[PDB]
Amino acid sequence: APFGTLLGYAPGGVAIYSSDAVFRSYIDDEYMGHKWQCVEFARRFLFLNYGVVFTDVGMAWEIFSLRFLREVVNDNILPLQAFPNGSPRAPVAGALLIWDKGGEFKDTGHVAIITQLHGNKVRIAEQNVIHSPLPQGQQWTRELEMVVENGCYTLKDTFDDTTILGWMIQTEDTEYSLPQPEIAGELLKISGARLENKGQFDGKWLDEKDPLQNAYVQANGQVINQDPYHYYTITESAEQELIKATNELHLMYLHATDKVLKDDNLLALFDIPKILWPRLRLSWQRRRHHMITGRMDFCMDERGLKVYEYNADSASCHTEAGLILERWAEQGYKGNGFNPAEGLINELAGAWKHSRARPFVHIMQDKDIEENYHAQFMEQALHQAGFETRILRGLDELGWDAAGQLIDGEGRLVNCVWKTWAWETAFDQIREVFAAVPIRTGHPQNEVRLIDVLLRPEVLVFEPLWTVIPGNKAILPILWSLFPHHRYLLDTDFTVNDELVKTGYAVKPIAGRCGSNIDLVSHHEEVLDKTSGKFAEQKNIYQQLWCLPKVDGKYIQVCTFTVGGNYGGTCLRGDESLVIKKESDIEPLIVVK
Amino acid sequence: APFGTLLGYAPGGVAIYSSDYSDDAVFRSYIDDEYMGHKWQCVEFARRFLFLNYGVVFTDVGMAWEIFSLRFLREVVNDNILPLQAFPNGSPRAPVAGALLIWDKGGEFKDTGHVAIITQLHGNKVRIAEQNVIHSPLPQGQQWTRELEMVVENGCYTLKDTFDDTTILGWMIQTEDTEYSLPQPEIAGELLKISGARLENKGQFDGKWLDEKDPLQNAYVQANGQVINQDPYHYYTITESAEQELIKATNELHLMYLHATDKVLKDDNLLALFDIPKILWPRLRLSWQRRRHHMITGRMDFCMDERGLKVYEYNADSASCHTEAGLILERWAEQGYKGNGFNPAEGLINELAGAWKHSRARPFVHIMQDKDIEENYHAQFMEQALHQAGFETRILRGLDELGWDAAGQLIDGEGRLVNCVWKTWAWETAFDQIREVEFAAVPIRTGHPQNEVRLIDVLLRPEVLVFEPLWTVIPGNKAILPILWSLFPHHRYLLDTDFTVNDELVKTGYAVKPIAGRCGSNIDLVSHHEEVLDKTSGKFAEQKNIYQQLWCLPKVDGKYIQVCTFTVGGNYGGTCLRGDESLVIKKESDIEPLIVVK
Ligand SMILES: Nc1ncnc2c1ncn2[C@@H]1O[C@H](COP(=O)(O)OP(=O)(O)O)[C@@H](O)[C@H]1O
């Protein structure tokens, strides 16, 4: 049958169809996958029958490496175990069956659902294998022979050149299960590289015909770093580890956020004005799927991969990674590798298209040359997604009508805004000074403040208010508490405890940014580095010391973007010091296989 | 200014609109799925202000003055229930910013009373915000509508209204601190007495008093004849104050039931008590999450008389009696009643049409009923509400007309796809089909030789949007009673219920009731003297039981009379009476004319 024709149904009545964002398959606002791939079927099956889902993956074979499932109704996280083909642990109905990449399933690998177990066979349901209508009421696509001998179960596939990895069961019983796959240190090494110097960057290599690249130059000049002929590389294996961690930590952060918002004692730790709490909760409940983009900061090298923080509120660097660096490669890279942030623009337009933003969105940026290209970069994504826009620089163009409605300069109503401003800046206006958030709805001089916009109930804001929770460092000790000793986490606390004193630690303000007010204390007493900034008075958290690697004279940090909650790209930042700050450079990154 | 024009904003940016009135569905005001009130009344503003700024709301009330008797607020984000205290005007407890301020009915606020929000305290005064008082644009930026003088005399605070003929009851603060607060009012027993009454016999009902040209009434007659009870000239009455109490109880218990439902669906230990097939658990939860606001109607069963008001159960899944109370009794009144009272269920059909209009049912609704003539008029009554709301429908009697296409889609007789279903069947009947049969999913068919479609093949098809939603089996299962008792111990309207006969129950006597039964089946009433007062047979003798504190119906004019109230969209939608010669009301008990009298 053609594309999308109904071929049959798997148990419980889950359709099986024959097999850029018109291909997204959703149930309510829960993403199932890309029509009509094998993963989309497996996730939809689990969603409709058991209310759980597995995290976004690039290819089906990667599913076998996952060790958790997300229970959609409460954002809970469940254990998922993996068993190798030939296991004493029988493959029960409902289990995920995973194929490694290879043969019939060349680069992708494959995934199916086991529907029934017999004595010498098993029936499974799947998408993207069978493309013809199944017979009346038959709720399985293929039967695979099973050999039970000496208590061990082995499945034999119908293709002569495939490799079945095993099956996965949602259970706490670890017996017979395999440990989580850990990447070998060496594949995570960041290494330096050089371009042949033929003078590719000895002039105006950035196109001043492009308004966007022009805005960048006006704020930075024709420069990315101290030596544009030098770049770094990472293995494709490393990129996949980054993608995995990004997708997992994002879910881990959302789970801790839910926990925080369900408990006043945990919420009090964030130092957000109490008058906002009910609103934080409302935002969490109704804008849960509305986060557009964020950035995670990681330390990556032979030692493994650890997250320092997650900039979920107002993340930048997009332009540099998804545009300036594309121009850089285009201008001087003749290699086989690729810029892992190449599709950022498109990914973002995708998020905006499936968001519930109003047709016209006002973009709010500070009157600051550096913010001009960021605001215009997002405007291009909004335009590609079909929205009309207007850029507000500063707050002077804003005023109120007689009734107290918000209007812009051309006289239109402002009811939807994407901002570059951090929510914390608005919280400051509350703390400077009631039965409600004290916002003005009229002024003799028509003086509109930041909070008078962002907290007007009728204004639809992006990023949503709840994002101040995962973007506040007070969440780190909570994440450590919920997932103690997790491979990607660093032990962090609200005090310098016994183990921390033993490991050395970083002191970081909970609502800071740009590498401000950071103190790095070695496992001795010595202060490795300390920075200044305006956040020295806020509460701090203490995070296990885990210093950036030094490669070719610079400390290099890896950053990944989330867009709509999934990996959207990678970029590097480098600094002469251990602490990355707003003025650290963007370093060209090439992923090589 | 005109009706609906923005006059300004209260603190936090909550708009205040003009309510000058010079399908009322356009009149309902929501924020997302939350009902705030009627545009643009004082109650609508109060609730919208509390929802927007604090994420809480108070239940539906008939009049504003009634808010003062409330003792809880609902937290929207988790269906949690918060304590609310009332303080009289002149109390030591000061009227803080954010507090509700209630006026009794009287003077400028005639019979509705009034409600406002206190926005700020000034030692000698207080500013407040409200909606149905001033209808003109407020000064630019001013976020309050009126100032009231406040006098502070010896630790106490008293407010004086700007009108000379009004009465301020006091203010309410969401706190667990009870100091200085009022005890929740309780109605006087005598006011809850149900009285017998009689019409003059002039032959009004001696012939064909039900109009047989009206399909609905005709369908009623084909099942029951031109009869409602044994003596159509006799009726019962209750006071307007007893009805206000029923309205109040109904709204409160519905939320208590939804709160217990949430708690059950969060804990596997509690859910296992319901004896529902494990394979459905994930679905039950999905339903509660997605269909939270889609319940259309339910019926609560109460014992009411001078001892008070107690609830026996809540038929949340498949309830009937709508046709009787809202149509047949309307015809009865029109035909023989010439007094000043009214049928408390007279607006049922309109209430129902409104719920459907705001539901998210698909454009075409298939009505599924069993082949019982008694179910014909019930299916047709609901079809009338559906039609009134703009939906197209087709009634399916039994499952014979159903079949699947080549791939396995569900179609009706005329071949149209079955997408939306309002059923008359109980969910437990489908649950039984599962019990009859380890699968990896609900074992439904999507193809068969004979094209034999079972009930579950329709109701548990993912693509079929069914009403009532699946989650309603929880509040309709009597396993929820001990849970509810556990959550609200000694609550005013609740009866002590357990899964065993405990010490307190032996002392009071108790009713033994199957958790998934209906219609008075397999009920055992046992006295404190340890004597069986009554037993009914039936088909549910094998399931788990709950034991509920004995509280027998009152006997009035020869019959035990039970009070039932309908819920429509989560709020009170009417009241009706059922009477029997025995203590246990059954499917065959009759409907008794009821008139609310002022
Ligand atoms: N635990 C840590 N160990 C070593 N260096 C750290 C640690 N945490 C942070 N740093 C350094 O400080 C910089 C700032 O910390 P980060 O958590 O990203 O906060 P922000 O960038 O919001 O100020 C990092 O980019 C890194 O160079």
Ligand SMILES: Nc1ncnc2c1ncn2[C@@H]1O[C@H](COP(=O)(O)OP(=O)(O)O)[C@@H](O)[C@H]1O
């Ligand atoms: N605790 C109780 N004390 C006295 N009578 C009761 C009690 N519970 C139920 N009954 C009687 O039994 C009838 C049936 O019980 P009910 O709870 O309504 O279950 P159902 O109608 O679903 O079978 C009631 O209408 C009432 O007459």
Ligand SMILES: [Mg+2]
């Ligand atoms: Mg950082």
Ligand SMILES: [Mg+2]
């Ligand atoms: Mg940061």
Ligand SMILES: [Mg+2]
């Ligand atoms: Mg009953």
Ligand SMILES: [Mg+2]
């Ligand atoms: Mg019942």
